[PDB]
Design an enzyme around this catalytic site. Structure first.
Site, short mmCIF file in Angstrom:
data_model
loop_
_atom_site.label_atom_id
_atom_site.label_comp_id
_atom_site.label_asym_id
_atom_site.label_seq_id
_atom_site.Cartn_x
_atom_site.Cartn_y
_atom_site.Cartn_z
N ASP B 17 0.92 -1.19 0.06
CA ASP B 17 0.03 0.17 0.06
C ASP B 17 0.89 1.50 -0.11
O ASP B 17 1.76 1.34 0.85
CB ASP B 17 -1.01 -0.01 1.17
CG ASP B 17 -1.90 1.33 1.19
OD1 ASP B 17 -2.84 1.22 0.34
OD2 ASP B 17 -1.69 1.94 2.18
N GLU B 65 0.98 -0.55 -5.41
CA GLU B 65 0.44 0.58 -5.76
C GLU B 65 1.38 1.77 -5.66
O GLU B 65 1.52 2.33 -4.77
CB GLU B 65 -0.89 0.85 -4.66
CG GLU B 65 -1.45 2.01 -4.74
CD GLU B 65 -2.39 2.11 -3.71
OE1 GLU B 65 -2.19 2.46 -2.51
OE2 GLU B 65 -3.81 1.93 -3.75
#
Lengths: 212, 380, 194
Positions: B17, B65
């Site tokens: 993330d 990401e």
């Protein structure tokens, strides 16, 4: 000590294998659960064997089981086999290969690198090699010049990422070990060995890691 | 930590993330400390180098990401070592804008269908390094993508400030779950079109929990603070929407069965051909809302896919293959269970026969906002 | 050829006046290409009952067309129709195209028995999707489509799969649309949807 191997099949199933060091032979048991697509029994052919070992029901048709035995004095080897339904169709692994299982060595663990000994006395080997497509372990006895024991490593069971590992119940009768990478039969020195042998310029440049 | 999870809990891979933060520089390299300040992005960050070339971690799945909240945006340029995969947000934006109908997105859509070679091929990565998705846990669900033109986040207690503001959605004519029959039919068509687009693209498809039966969050596009059934899988509501679930299962099965759908390399021009309303004349103009292609398959022979994102129905011409004819498989406009044809259907042959006067002359009629898939079979 | 012959018979049977056709035209009699056969006492000019059974589909189409003309009172009119009863449409409802390139003529008319019928002729070489008139509370049901294979070119209750055939086109009919081939004709009847 027994070892267990679970193989996914090419027809959405599971084959379970167990290898036991019977109190000096070896026993291999095969258990196939589930039934969706094949109904009329299976025969275990040893990777194209003309003979066959039919699998018998174990607990009321839920599972089919078979048992194979092997005599002692056999150096570490591999058992390869295939499954067949009552149609001629062959069941393979999910990688489209015959089910291959080691007899005489354990799977081992990828850490720590080098040679280590567990509490029970099992000897673990681990070495990193990204580029080598085949790794072999050599064991030498007190003199050696040629390996007393040679063990090829299965590229599926004896690898975790790019680390090749293997376990041995005992190294009794041996003093040195080495590694062979690729198809080349030249024995290499373990980079993480803590004790090494003598630098011998063979007729070459070879050094063996010590098992002490 | 990563090695521990891999070797003790048998985890197959990781997804990171806000992964752009892991490329920012450390303060230890300032000229005051030794003898480019803190947080400056690097081309070879030591942590990514350590992860990619680890003896154990180098052979597992790594997905990034590739952005953070500090303004960084590295989609297509993350330091990958030819190993790292990425959440493709450009795919998300392009597909969301094309499927709802927007000028100037046909070429981007065709590039998305091929695995985005314009972002990955030059650097030495493969089509499957692209993780394609339309909806995720953050943002709209698939059902809310076709129901709301704007977020409704007032239950969060932050006066509608939080949440993505440009969702790129269309309510199919009316706002909210109360609409006419035609609007609901169009919404079902559009969900099927999104899943078809996801399942025929090069790359790795990903979709969120409950999108297979049409989960709804009421228009809330940022639901991080609700332990409440708005965030729960509805097993009771799943049974009321078995048609969409059946369609998704069949389309995933179709992707698994075709050898030309998940490719190890970027498709070449000898295998893939682009078409338009007429075969062999694709329309890349700014006003175009139509993309169609045909690819050679070692299993099914040949398949043909068409997307009609226009508000006007059209009859399209099919490629001419003497000795063969096209057979209908998928049509998102048809009522269920005829949106997907299977041999479990007792009326399959009759339903196909009722379109023979169109199929014989290499034609097919399409509704607005629909998709079709056809297969080539010998005819002699 | 079959499509065009059905189109000719449809146009004959939906025109205002008295229909008229020569014997053997209901099953496709061929003369070998001879347009003037006034001096032949040959089998070319004799009705063939051996080939009538081979063309049963076209014969059935003609019989059903004549029965449909009998059952519809908007076809036998003592006076000329007026604009109140008859309306003209094109590709879109209420926009007929009378230009020199036009090859599409369509109309809709009201009936006291059938309610309303819609007739379209597409003489163009390109298939088209036409827009049906918007009638709130009703819908259009396929009756005749010269492009469809027999026996579905004419829909009757004698067919065991009529409802399924309508259902397989419901996705087009629900949005007031109908797909048409080139050189084809369609007739639809208005029916309540409640």
């Amino acid at each position: 000590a027994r070892s267990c191997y679970r193989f996914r099949t090419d027809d959405d199933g599971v084959v379970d294998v167990a290898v036991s060091g019977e109190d000096g032979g070896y026993a291999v048991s095969v258990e196939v659960p589930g039934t969706r697509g094949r109904e009329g029994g299976l025969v275990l052919r040893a990777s194209g064997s003309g003979e066959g070992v039919p699998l018998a029901p174990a607990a009321g048709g839920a599972s089919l089981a078979a048992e194979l035995s092997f005599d002692p004095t056999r150096a570490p080897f591999y058992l390869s086999f295939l499954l067949t339904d009552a149609s001629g169709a062959e069941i393979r692994t999910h990688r489209k290969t015959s089910f291959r299982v080691p007899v005489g060595v354990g799977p081992g663990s990828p850490a720590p690198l080098g040679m280590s000994i567990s509490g029970d006395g099992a000897v673990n080997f681990a070495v990193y090699s990204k580029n080598a497509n085949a790794v072999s372990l050599y064991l030498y006895a007190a003199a050696g010049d040629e390996p007393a024991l040679e063990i090829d490593l299965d590229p599926y069971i004896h690898r975790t990422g790019n680390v090749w590992h293997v376990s041995l119940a005992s190294v009794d009768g041996y003093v040195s070990y080495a590694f062979c990478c690729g198809g080349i039969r030249r024995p290499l020195l373990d980079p993480y060995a803590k004790v090494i042998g003598d630098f011998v310029s063979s007729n070459s440049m070879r050094c063996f890691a010590s098992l002490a | 930590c990563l090695r521990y999870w891999v070797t003790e809990m048998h985890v197959d891979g990781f997804r990171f993330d806000l992964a752009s933060i892991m490329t920012r520089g450390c303060s230890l390299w300032d000229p005051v400390n030794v003898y480019t300040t803190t947080g400056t992005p690097l081309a070879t960050p030591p942590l990514i180098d350590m992860i990619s070339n680890d003896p154990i971690l180098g052979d597992v799945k790594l997905i990034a990401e590739a952005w953070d909240a500090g303004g960084l945006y590295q989609v297509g340029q993350f330091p990958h070592w030819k190993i790292w995969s990425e959440w493709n947000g450009k795919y998300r934006d392009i597909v969301r804008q094309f499927i709802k109908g927007t000028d100037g997105f046909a070429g981007g859509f065709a590039e998305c269908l091929c695995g985005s070679p314009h972002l990955y091929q030059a650097g030495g990565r493969k089509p499957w390094h692209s993780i394609n998705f339309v909806c995720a846990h953050d943002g709209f669900t698939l059902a809310d993508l076709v129901t709301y033109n704007k977020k409704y986040n007032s239950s969060n207690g932050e006066d509608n400030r939080d949440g993505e503001n440009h969702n790129l959605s269309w309510n199919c004519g009316e706002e909210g779950e109360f609409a006419g029959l035609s609007v609901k039919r169009l919404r079902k068509r559009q969900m099927r079109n999104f899943f078809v687009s996801l399942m025929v693209s090069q790359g790795v498809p990903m979709f969120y929990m409950g999108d297979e039966y049409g989960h709804t969050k009421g228009g809330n596009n940022n639901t991080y603070c609700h332990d409440h059934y708005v965030n729960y899988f509805r097993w009771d509501k799943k049974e009321e929407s078995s048609d969409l679930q059946r369609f998704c299962s069949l389309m995933t099965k179709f992707r698994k069965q075709c050898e030309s759908l998940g490719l190890a390399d970027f498709p070449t021009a000898q295998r893939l051909h682009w078409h338009g309303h007429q075969p062999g004349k694709p329309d890349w103009s700014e006003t175009s809302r139509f993309v169609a292609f045909s690819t050679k398959d070692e299993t099914k022979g040949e398949i043909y896919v068409a997307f009609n994102a226009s508000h006007l129905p059209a009859v399209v011409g099919l490629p001419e293959r003497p000795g063969y004819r096209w057979e209908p498989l998928v049509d998102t406009g048809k009522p269920a269970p005829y949106d997907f044809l299977t041999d479990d259907l007792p009326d399959r042959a009759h339903a196909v026969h009722l379109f023979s006067h169109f199929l014989n002359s290499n034609l097919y009629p399409m509704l607005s906002y629909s998709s079709i898939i056809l297969e080539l079979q010998p005819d002699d």
